[PDB]
Swiss-Prot record, chains A, B:
PROSITE patterns: CARBOXYLESTERASE_B_1, CARBOXYLESTERASE_B_2. Keywords: Cell membrane, Disulfide bond, Glycoprotein, GPI-anchor, Hydrolase, Lipoprotein, Membrane, Neurotransmitter degradation, Serine esterase, Signal, Synapse. It holds the Pfam family COesterase. The lineage of its organism: Eukaryota, Metazoa, Chordata, Craniata, Vertebrata. The gene is ache. This is Acetylcholinesterase. Found in the synapses and to a lower extent in extrajunctional areas of muscle and nerve, and on erythrocyte membranes. It comes from Tetronarce californica (Pacific electric ray).
Length: 528, 528
């Protein structure tokens, strides 16, 4: 039995699944920690106690408790990101697809979902690992981690809610993979972590954090990086937001112990109903409970670690999509709709910029406005919409990433940078939204290989080229087999487009805007 | 006798001069003030006292004492701007060209020379009025005014050295036209003042200043406006620079009366030798002794007079040249030369920005750099050369002028704006300098009409259309006889190119950059 595997914590029984005219083994819902319920809510995870008997790993697990998006109910485009199982605090499980026949000690890839640290699930259709596992002969793992207040409530100095527990969830699944993946045909010495949005930030946080470094080999970051402005907060802002969650729910605030005790008595969705209330500003692309810069998981500030080379030195493959900003504008900024072209007045432009840079003084806002307005044609709806689209994507994803890539490449052992700009032929979102945050994932996970999902043949070919770059990179530290994706170097700053056309190599991704965002604006905000 | 005219201060005898194979009358070297010599150095001008007999006005006067440029000795391109007569403090004279036969009561144009308030002459070949006078049938006057410390040494509170006496020279020459021009066939109700660079700034200071307003009808400003960053200083900075002039010359600094007395015993060129020493910073396009905002010639700050409409309401015609900055970079910035393409390293670009905006803090300098650098291609010597060129132009001439024209047009009675971008066929400066500060003047004064100067036919036609637009505007407030130069309006902000090609109307001259210079950079420098 291929399907019956003994792990360090007990036996597990998977299920044989179909993929593209063949089959593979899937092991769904394997527990890697004790359920973090009751008194364990907000605590570091504990390893799962060994169980007797056979764990039924034939079906997907619960998803962690999270804010459910109801903006477009029944709309496929938004529903595909929402949980597709029952939500429960009992949600620390992982999932594994193993090629049939079982390999000997093959390359392992562990997927870390995004969703702004406030949402996500391991079980979504677009994260189905069976296509990538099959086509590339890797052992594919998806983990899960607490999100929202559950994962990231931070009262620094309490051991009861220390912060960063969702990251430590991640770290325990990786520890689990290190310990057990050899029984499924993986090499624990050849594991790649990869993920998107807060998942890509997560990946980079494990590159940084000393307790996480030795649990993987190399890394892929899609549309996220550790240093994103939404991806972390100071101990003092986490403490303020935690206390404010308390005040929103009429908690006793006299000490950490009484606050924590009161928050532990509330049902999950009571916390989620006030979660957004703790944000200190009106905004877009900001999340309430995120990683905290604590001196433990992160021993010093991210920038100082990045300048000093205090981070895992290995190979990384990362990149961005063309219009990262668009869905955040749709969901939170005035003048945008999924049923129109979303031409934006000048008034709505200016309000969108305040939302996008909520921490900027007036001089700050003026700077952004200035950098992104065509003053010959400032009442042009299309230019205002697209200029605000670039603000949001440059500020939140692209420029944070180009900073990370430049800092990392100084010490690293090799960097491959992409720019994903294919708009899929079957997209249900409107044209104006372009190449959307998250929409490279379907290609990574091989979904265009499924004829019933109505992708073009050229899209199947692109997904295959992407899968092979990613799996090759995972296996060898180099996405190219022995036409060529070059190494990004400090000197030449090369990157490739990723679309259906023949591969073009460019240099200096978004340098002009990235200088503004990485060098001038911070300098101005620090001076004023 | 057409040549013998009796004026309010005595009789004058002019001379018949050949022009384009006809003739006209010239009255050269007419005194309009007492010689501002000895104990009148630094004081307000006084009116010329009447003379007996007949003043011989057959030859040009002396030029005012000034720093003579010796950077390119005998090179025609720089010597055309230097004094071509003896320098003397006894320099307050004016020149008049009258059509023959004498007209009855025709349009007058009075020219005010530039040269940064530290130089210039009424007598240059390029300012010879006979072509414009003859072709357009106008009475053409050129005045003179003290420059440098002789005209702008300001010790506010003293009546011996109040500041702005060069402006009052100009104004006395205007009062003399108002009183005497009817005798030469001009109408004093129909006078236009025009000037270039500091001349143009001059013209606009007369529009602003209550004491000058009633001595002209309308105005033409060429590459200068009153609010230029070099065109004025506070009474504090004026005082500081006058004291420093004293210190550079070992003067008793114990009182105004003692400092002034010492500066009056110095020979003129000893002031001139240390003139540049008093500037606060290393700079380009900055000049030591300039108009002061005194509370008398200018009752309040230029900006509040402009905002409140406290100025003469009339018709204006004004404009700028394509490459105003270029000769300033040649004379004073690193990597520039008249004999090469002046491809500028990034280091010489940076050191050029600091000279170009000598007041800026580091944040300021950063902003400028960022606005004018292509970060894809930052070591491109040509893009750096041209970027710095535009900096110098935009900051010192174009954006000050575009501020002025927008504030003026809210109250004025008609504005016409031009962008002169014709590089002359027979230019002696290199191509990199483009369309140079001062090089429209030859068109305006009709020099291309002289075959021996070896302009093309099309440059001849251009000079004729230009003279005709200026003289038609002088005559009627509208450059067009009713292809049409449209009015500049607050809404549509139209202007035309002036070159050898058919008219193009465009909108919003240099708005993208003028937004940075007039709105953002000043907020940035105000916070920090
Ligand atoms: O960004 C916002 C928007 C609105 C608001 C705020 N912030 C805070 C202040 C209050 C305001 N409204 C409060 C409720 C917030 C609504 C929550 C946003 C829902 C986002 C849905 C996440 N889904 C994903 C989508 C896409 N890509 C994703 C990729 C990463 C995983 C999640 C994704 C592409 C298109 C549509 C959806
Ligand atoms: O602008 C500068 C340049 C250099 C320097 C400073 N400032 C201050 C710091 C010290 C430095 N060097 C000190 C010597 C100063 C020399 C002054 C420059 C001479 C310019 C001569 C005026 N000539 C004119 C020219 C032109 N146009 C003019 C139109 C306006 C009237 C004068 C003009 C076009 C081309 C060449 C010349
Ligand atoms: C395992 O669990 C699921 C769902 O709760 C069930 O439907 C399935 O048939 C079970 N199978 C075995 C072999 O235990
Ligand atoms: C990775 O490190 C090894 C030696 O430690 C070296 O040979 C190789 O060149 C490095 N590669 C890159 C791209 O840094
Ligand atoms: C794609 O195409 C087919 C046939 O043209 C259709 O029946 C099916 O509904 C479409 N697939 C999806 C899931 O959109
Ligand atoms: C006036 O001066 C000029 C030139 O120096 C000359 O040709 C003419 O003789 C003079 N006229 C009289 C009356 O002196
Ligand atoms: C100039 O003023 C007159 C009346 O004083 C007016 O009717 C005319 O339109 C004005 N023109 C402009 C361009 O303001």
């Amino acid at each position: 039995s291929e399907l019956l595997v003994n792990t360090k914590s007990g036996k597990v029984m998977g299920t044989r699944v179909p993929v593209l005219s063949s089959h593979i083994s899937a092991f769904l819902g394997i527990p890697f920690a004790e359920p973090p319920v009751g008194n364990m809510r907000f605590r570091r995870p504990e390893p799962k106690k060994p169980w007797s008997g056979v764990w039924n790993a034939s079906t997907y697990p619960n998803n962690c408790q999270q804010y459910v998006d109801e903006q477009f109910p029944g709309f496929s485009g938004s529903e595909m990101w929402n949980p597709n199982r029952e939500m429960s605090e009992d949600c620390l499980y992982l999932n594994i697809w193993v090629p049939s026949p079982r390999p000997k000690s093959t390359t392992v890839m562990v997927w870390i979902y995004g969703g702004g640290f406030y949402s996500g699930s391991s079980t979504l259709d677009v994260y189905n690992g069976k296509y990538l596992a099959y086509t590339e002969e890797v052992v594919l793992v998806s983990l899960s981690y607490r999100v929202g207040a559950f994962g990231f409530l931070a009262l620094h100095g309490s051991q009861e809610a220390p912060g960063n527990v969702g990251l430590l969830d991640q770290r325990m699944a990786l520890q689990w993979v290190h310990d057990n993946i050899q029984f499924f045909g993986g090499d624990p010495k050849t594991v790649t972590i990869f993920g998107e949005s807060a998942g890509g930030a997560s990946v980079g946080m494990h590159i940084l954090s000393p307790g996480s470094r030795d649990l993987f080999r190399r890394a892929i970051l899609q549309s996220g990086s550790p240093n994103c402005p939404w991806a972390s907060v100071s101990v003092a802002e986490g403490r303020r937001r935690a206390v404010e969650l308390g005040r929103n729910l009429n908690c006793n605030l006299n000490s950490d112990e009484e606050l924590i005790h009161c928050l532990r008595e509330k049902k999950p969705q009571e916390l989620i109903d006030v979660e957004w209330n703790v944000l200190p500003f009106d905004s877009i692309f900001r999340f309430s409970f995120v990683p905290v810069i604590d001196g433990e998981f992160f021993p010093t500030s991210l920038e100082s670690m990045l300048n000093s080379g205090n981070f895992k030195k290995t190979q990384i493959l990362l990149g961005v999509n063309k219009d990262e900003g668009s869905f955040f504008l749709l969901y939170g900024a005035p003048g945008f709709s999924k049923d129109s072209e979303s031409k934006i007045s000048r008034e709505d432009f200016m309000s969108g910029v305040k939302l996008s840079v909520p921490h900027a003084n007036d001089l700050g806002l003026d700077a952004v406005t200035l950098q992104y307005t065509d003053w010959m044609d400032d009442n042009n709806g299309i230019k205002n919409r697209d200029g605000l689209d670039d603000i949001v994507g440059d500020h939140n994803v692209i420029c944070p990433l180009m900073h990370f890539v430049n800092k990392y490449t100084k010490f690293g052992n090799g960097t491959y940078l992409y720019f994903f700009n294919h708009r899929a032929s079957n997209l249900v979102w409107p044209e104006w939204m372009g190449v959307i945050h998250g929409y490279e994932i379907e290609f990574v996970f091989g979904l265009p290989l499924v004829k019933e999902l109505n992708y073009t043949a050229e899209e199947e070919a692109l997904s295959r080229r992407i899968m092979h770059y990613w799996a090759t990179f995972a296996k060898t530290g180099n996405p190219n087999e022995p036409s060529k994706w070059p190494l990004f170097t400090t000197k030449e700053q090369k990157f490739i487009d990723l679309n259906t056309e023949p591969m073009k190599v460019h240099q200096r991704l978004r340098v002009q805007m990235c200088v503004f965002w990485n060098q001038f604006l911070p300098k101005l905000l620090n001076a004023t």
